[PDB]
């Protein structure tokens, strides 16, 4: 009885927010994808900018 | 790149063009004006002596 009670209490508190955390993580994954693309644009932009100096 | 072209044109034309044209014009005009002033001084002195 008591061990089952303790496990259920542990379960309810952490249950819901875990999925939300995972979705947040994958959204951050897409965000990093886009930042990488922007920096890929950055290198070529600077290289073309080279000779203005 | 547009800014680059601005820089290119401004460097190529203005500096050298102004240098050459201003130097030649100023030197020639200054020499001519100095000679004319000396001649005018001589003529004024001659007129004053005659007076």
Q: Are B3 and A48 in contact (CB under 8 A)?
A: no
Nearest CA in chain A to B2: A52
Neighbours of A21 (CB within 10 A): 8
Q: How far apart are CA A44 and CA A49, in angstroms?
A: 8
Q: Which residues of chain A are within 8 Å of residue B7 when distances are taken between CB atoms? A: 52
Q: How far apart are CA A24 and CA A28, in angstroms?
A: 6
Listed in sequence order, the residues at least 6 apart from A33 whose beta carbon sits closer than 8 Å to its beta carbon are none
Q: How far does the CA of residue B4 sit from the closest CA of chain A (Å)?
A: 6
Q: How far apart are CA A25 and CA A31, in angstroms?
A: 10
Q: How far does the CA of residue A41 sit from the closest CA of chain B (Å)?
A: 16
- The count of C-alpha atoms lying within 13 angstroms of the C-alpha of A25, restricted to the half-sphere facing its C-beta, is 6
Resolution rounded to one decimal, in angstroms: 3.1
Q: Write out the DSSP string of B13-34.
A: IIIHHHHHHHHHHHHHHHHHHH
Q: Which residues of chain B are within 8 Å of residue A48 when distances are taken between CB atoms? A: 1
Q: What is the DSSP letter of A17?
A: H
Lookup: tokens for A26: 């994958």
């Amino acid at each position: 009885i008591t061990a089952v009670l303790q496990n259920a209490v542990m379960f309810l508190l952490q249950k819901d927010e875990a999925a939300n955390k995972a979705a947040l993580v994958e959204a951050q994954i897409k965000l990093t994808e886009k930042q990488g693309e922007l920096l890929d644009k950055q290198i070529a932009q600077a290289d073309k900018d080279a000779e203005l100096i | 790149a547009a800014k680059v072209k601005l820089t290119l044109e401004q460097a190529k034309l203005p500096d050298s063009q102004i240098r050459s044209a201003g130097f030649q014009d100023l030197l020639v005009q200054e020499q001519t004006k100095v000679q004319t002033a000396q001649t005018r001084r001589i003529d004024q002195e001659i007129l004053s002596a005659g007076f």
